[PDB]
Nucleic acid binder design. Sequence first.
DNA 1: TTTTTTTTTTT
Lengths: 589, 589, 197
Amino acid sequence: QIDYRDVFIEFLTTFKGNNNQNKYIERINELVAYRKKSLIIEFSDVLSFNENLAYEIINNTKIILPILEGALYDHILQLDPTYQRDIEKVHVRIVGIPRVIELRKIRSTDIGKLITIDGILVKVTPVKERIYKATYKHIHPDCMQEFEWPEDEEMPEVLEMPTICPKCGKPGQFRLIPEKTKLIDWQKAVIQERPEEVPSGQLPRQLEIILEDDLVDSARPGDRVKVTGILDIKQDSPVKRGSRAVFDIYMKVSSIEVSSEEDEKKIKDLAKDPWIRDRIISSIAPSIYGHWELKEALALALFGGVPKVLEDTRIRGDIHILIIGDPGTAKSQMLQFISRVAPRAVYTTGKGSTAAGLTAAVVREKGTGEYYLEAGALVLADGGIAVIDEIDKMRDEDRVAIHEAMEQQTVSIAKAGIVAKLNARAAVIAAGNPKFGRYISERPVSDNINLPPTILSRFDLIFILKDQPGEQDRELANYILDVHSGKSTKNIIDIDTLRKYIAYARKYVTPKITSEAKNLITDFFVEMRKKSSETPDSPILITPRQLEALIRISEAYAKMALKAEVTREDAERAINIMRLFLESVGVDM
Amino acid sequence: QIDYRDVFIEFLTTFKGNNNQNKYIERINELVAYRKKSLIIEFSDVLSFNENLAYEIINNTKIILPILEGALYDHILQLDPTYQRDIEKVHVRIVGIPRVIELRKIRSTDIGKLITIDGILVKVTPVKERIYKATYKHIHPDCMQEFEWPEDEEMPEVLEMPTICPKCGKPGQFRLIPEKTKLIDWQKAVIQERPEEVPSGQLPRQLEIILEDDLVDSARPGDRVKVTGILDIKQDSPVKRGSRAVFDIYMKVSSIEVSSEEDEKKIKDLAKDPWIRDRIISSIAPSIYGHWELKEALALALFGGVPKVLEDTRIRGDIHILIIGDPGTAKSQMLQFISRVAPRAVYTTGKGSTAAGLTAAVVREKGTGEYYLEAGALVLADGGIAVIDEIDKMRDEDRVAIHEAMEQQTVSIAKAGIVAKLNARAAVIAAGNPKFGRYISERPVSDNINLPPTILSRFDLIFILKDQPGEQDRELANYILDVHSGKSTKNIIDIDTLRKYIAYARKYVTPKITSEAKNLITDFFVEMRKKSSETPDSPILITPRQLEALIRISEAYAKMALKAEVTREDAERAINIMRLFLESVGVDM
Amino acid sequence: VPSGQLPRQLEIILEDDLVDSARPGDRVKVTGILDIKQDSPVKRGSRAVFDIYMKVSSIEVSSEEDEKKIKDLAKDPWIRDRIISSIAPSIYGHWELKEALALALFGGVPKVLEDTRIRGDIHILIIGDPGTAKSQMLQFISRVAPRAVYTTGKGSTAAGLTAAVVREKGTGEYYLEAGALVLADGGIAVIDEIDKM
DNA sequence: TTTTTTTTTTT
Ligand SMILES: [Mg+2]
Ligand SMILES: [Mg+2]
Ligand SMILES: [Zn+2]
Ligand SMILES: [Zn+2]
């Protein structure tokens, strides 16, 4: 009843933020600057400013939402006249609706109301076009008339053509005119409930959501999102007789949330401590005590090196880590920790999940038989980390293709008339059990993990975990039971703060090699080759790949402290960690 | 509104090229001389001549293209009256449009405007025919009348039949008359975005394009192309009731660019250098240190020999290279460089390495349940270079399947009621590791390679790469670190001009053997046979295939310098590189 | 099921608040009205034959005196010995095996830690000579457990154990069907002749 | 995709 348009306008311009800065005006100006056409607002702010306005939004969103958008559009064009002729319709979206419904609990009483759903995206269709105002021509030798059939109404989701020509009042044949037809971007996605909320002995439920206008391509598949909108009954084919008076339901998305400058200031401040490197090492897997060398390697892997892209060649910048632990050594604890702390990670096994084990595969279409490509674990992890538990029982097909993916970081297909090349620039962290149950120290590494020696040369660092029944058993037994009761350490960095720290470093730090670091690395590599040459039965191969590992590892240390250059200290740490790796495999360095 | 066909005609004649030669006048002459029926206009020459003409072409493309084409047709008619009743309608093509949009960024606002898209062609359908003006006959005993159904309007993409006979104003049934129906050539192709612009973790997207009239068969799958035209919605099955007002997007191609006299001048200037051969060799994989003899061999395989086609036989002209080396010897890095510089190359490491994936596969056509052949790696590489990696890891039964393709350059299949032959004229470059992962000096050459002599005789050159630590490690380490520091070698022919040089040489230079070269080659072959007979323990058979390898190599050296005949120096170079290959396998001379 | 015959099936319809009142594999008692099923009325041409379906009005799955009886049993100091003696009374000996089988029926307490999860279920493997009554006890366990699934190594497949994809031919749609392991969630899965799988 | 029996190519 009461015109909230004035109330809405003053609320946007007079919203007391964290410091009465009127942040809504700031984002409105930002919207005009880049022509974003979409303004999001928080339900809490509306309720605090005027609870009566908030109730109207959450109860009569069908009626008052277009009214509010018109008021906002008038304000924007009044503020800036150049916004016209570019955007004819602005969008206002609400977030933080208190009406949260579990996906399995949806019933008929929730149809037509504004609700929010939390779940996981599984499928996303390519962007398409939907008609909301069509133009038709009456093909009747006396008419030759054009009109817009859905008069004074948006074209419904069911494509219907006129039966009587409105201009001539006659039936006949009508032809669509694409050139005078209004279109809107249209995308379809599927949301699946999280496994935590699935009841015992039941399969997870699914829901179809529709993304339109700027909401298209707002979330990659496999992301946890929060979706707000209206539910409605799907009509796949209304002309299909055969009873079936039952229908599915779908969601018209109005706002989607996935999963700051202040963070950057605190991240740079956190890097001011000269002992930041050791603090990061301590913060890695705080649950597990000891294993400092293994912890140090994992920190370097997350940061990684700087890849080099040249005119004729590309040089890998990722770091690969192999762990061979005895059963019961709890090798899966920090692996789960790595997945959580990594900004982007993929968890899988040796056999993979789909037909494409790790690299890729070519699959005939089920309906038409056409050949297409399915991405493997390595491809899906591009730009991030690929954690592969149980590396020793990969598919036989992948045992050869993994050579190229782990070194050239590409997957090449020349099968069934399809030629393609897929990027696989992903750091690989893998764990495998010894082939003889328990690791044997005297035996080499190749005959202990059941992998070709060529693969071993592709791993920057290899570590062996042995369940030694020493004095630590009592402490380990106490430690295991303490984890059962619950305990934590002190003076660490939480995963949430650490995750953004790693992400910031990987996006803005590209260390460069200095002359002093260059000389130190050169001498060690020459020393490395001499030692391996003397022993005619070296358990490991010392190839030029090892020299690349020294460069990559040293860069990660500089990146760990957000250093612009690589100095002697970074190089010295890189040499020392490689020295321990050679001792672990049994090489007298 | 003012007209511009006078300006358009004026521009065609009054435009001045780089040397004021009026190329468009010359281009018109070529169009008349060869009855080309299509003209190409560079956009950079339109706004320079008249900026006003540029925008109206871009904006009002639909209502200005027929006007300009009609004016040009009259200009051709006066230039050559006989052009009439040979080509009734002419087309003009505009290239270099400033509006370039990434495939993933196409939205609703882009429909109906002239845009440009860069991508990769993946598949092309066979040429078909489309009706744009139909003729019908009213089957009603009174009528017996014939007419063209779509009056003063081109036939729409949806085939629509009249409901009322225009000649008699009555309903009934109508019969199409194919003899009086006007047709236009029609072809459908699919374009794919380049891997560079694909976001990480996502599969590349595709778009459907339509080529009509002379644009058909202007490109082949696997080509980097730049396409220009207008987008539209796809009404594939409008008769399919059941709602679904959602439509796809396809592209109406107006002009296409694949992949210049100035290039010819640059190429000819390079050939004038007496040491052009050395420069080309030095330009092969500059980032790799050493391996000069291997770099020389790779250059020869890029150019190849001269195939001989006779009335009774065919002789292979391609050169095959085999590389065996220890892990981490830059085998894969050098092979990846070949695919960048080769005009056409195919890569296959581990997937598709079976017999079916390498030559051809018999797959059941699920559309009709029958069988048909699918091209393999070698067939897809016909006319180019096939690169095979990790050949030693292939199964022996799978490896023998390429014996026919490597020599007879054909693939023959007799399986499941299918008997067919396919052309596989491609050069094969293969890399692999020794039998025991690393080369062992104690064992002989035969068991180190671990390949049957039947396949070894088909390789023109074989090289063994040994990673022996010594005093060269310091030089190698310095070179690698210099590469990582951004330092690059100078006086190197870059990539794209090297690719143009190879493409020009292959299709324009055909060296011939002289009497001087005949005597040198004959003498060496006799000497080679005698030496092989001396030692029966050699792992390499000296067959007549080795004699033809000398001829092929000598021709490639002449082709490398754009020479029309093989002289004494080219034969000496061919003999010298043969000596190194023989020494590399323990066969002294 | 009579001798030499296959089990029959009936279709039931749950509406309003009766939805999601049971899970697959449960033994239920259902009350309602029977009616003939019409699905394709437009499909003219013969077939005046219809199937019957049940319109559910109330459903029961599988209480005070029983709780009292249970408490009285637990009061005996030797309740543990009585329970073990009640496992497969027709089998002689095998006291140690019977004791372990009793533990698996009850199980432990699952624990959720900061990062990992500790299962409360107990896994038992039995290796014995032929004729050692191995299959007899497993049949008893599958019958006495409140929720159990009995499978055989030869009569099971990977799809049948975890989940099977069923293509809805009516609409060309894919959906999952619960396997043996999923149906046994919260219960006991019995696998006979695991070595022959 | 799925279980099944069959001939077939190819995993
Ligand atoms: Mg390699
Ligand atoms: Mg038994
Ligand atoms: Zn009309
Ligand atoms: Zn008529």
